[PDB]
Amino acid sequence: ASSFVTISGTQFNIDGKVGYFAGTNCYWCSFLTNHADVDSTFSHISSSGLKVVRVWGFNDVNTQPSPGQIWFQKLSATGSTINTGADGLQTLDYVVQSAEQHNLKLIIPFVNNWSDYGGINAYVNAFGGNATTWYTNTAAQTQYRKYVQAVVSRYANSTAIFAWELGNEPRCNGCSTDVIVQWATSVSQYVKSLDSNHLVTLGDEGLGLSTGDGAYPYTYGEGTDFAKNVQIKSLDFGTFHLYPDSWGTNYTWGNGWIQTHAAACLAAGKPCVFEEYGAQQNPCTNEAPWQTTSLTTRGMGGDMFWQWGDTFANGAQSNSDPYTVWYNSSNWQCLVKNHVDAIN
């Protein structure tokens, strides 16, 4: 079957099947000029047994790139431009079309907290203020909401969308936690007014939760409160991320991070998705136990590692980083095939 993704009780329902899912992150899948390169990559993800892919819904600039290069939006105080041309949102159309053809679903965020592919910083350059006042800057929010309608209106009736996502890792450093609560309540109400067929989520890392061991990620210095955010009425499920080598914690601490978040999602009546994770050293040894903890914890509906790597018909390879898991490699055997086999 081919249907809209919904919630069934405490779990997800994907094409009529209720139960736990595995997926992957592929930010770079959105910025390909040859659609055959998107299609070969999605053929590999589908034959591996994965069901969901996370891809970027943004590409923000203050000055247009070299002719031929991709850009989705140009931010300016004298009038901004949304690009629906061949070198614009048509490359994101390639990804939604490929998902329909290979039986996959997509999670899509609308802006980045970080400055990669523009982010909040590109809005700051155009409209003034700073990274924490962005949430309440009138001109910046008016343009963000126009960008949300331009993306949602293309795909609101496609069965390939898993969920819309407000941003990639939203933070408000040192702020009251109410700034993000009020912003997210208003923006998620707006997305639901444009599309009643699909689910909606925040995209946060999961910071700020009092049931943990007190390490920095559990404290309240980045403007977020996990229990308060997951109880917002117009959000349908919780998200959280995990990077111990950047956070100053050890690898085994990740199991407790998964368990506390899963319980907070279930106390709010909803599932959680373990949406982005990686270890810089020995990934097969250190990430495999995390995968088993998520599969066997009540309140967890799925997980997606960072990140997929692949190669094309011309012999070139995709964008890569220290966390890349290359298709058909020894780390694909340990973290993709073996995990899919344990789910079914």
Ligand SMILES: *[C@@H]1O[C@H](CO)[C@@H](O)[C@H](O)[C@H]1NC(C)=O
């Ligand atoms: C950003 O702007 C507001 C002032 O309008 C200020 O309260 C806050 O301290 C500033 N942030 C930084 C990092 O300086």
Ligand SMILES: *[C@@H]1O[C@H](CO)[C@@H](O)[C@H](O)[C@H]1NC(C)=O
């Ligand atoms: C598309 O989905 C909307 C709900 O978001 C629905 O009201 C509308 O009828 C659908 N369009 C078609 C052509 O069926």
Ligand SMILES: *[C@@H]1O[C@H](CO)[C@@H](O)[C@H](O)[C@H]1NC(C)=O
């Ligand atoms: C992947 O490996 C299988 C052998 O296990 C092979 O048949 C297939 O052609 C390979 N695909 C790629 C893209 O390397």
Ligand SMILES: *[C@H]1O[C@H](CO)[C@@H](O)[C@H](O)[C@H]1NC(C)=O
């Ligand atoms: C490290 O972290 C936890 C506390 O955060 C500690 O209880 C555990 O024994 C340690 N794990 C390893 C293997 O270092």
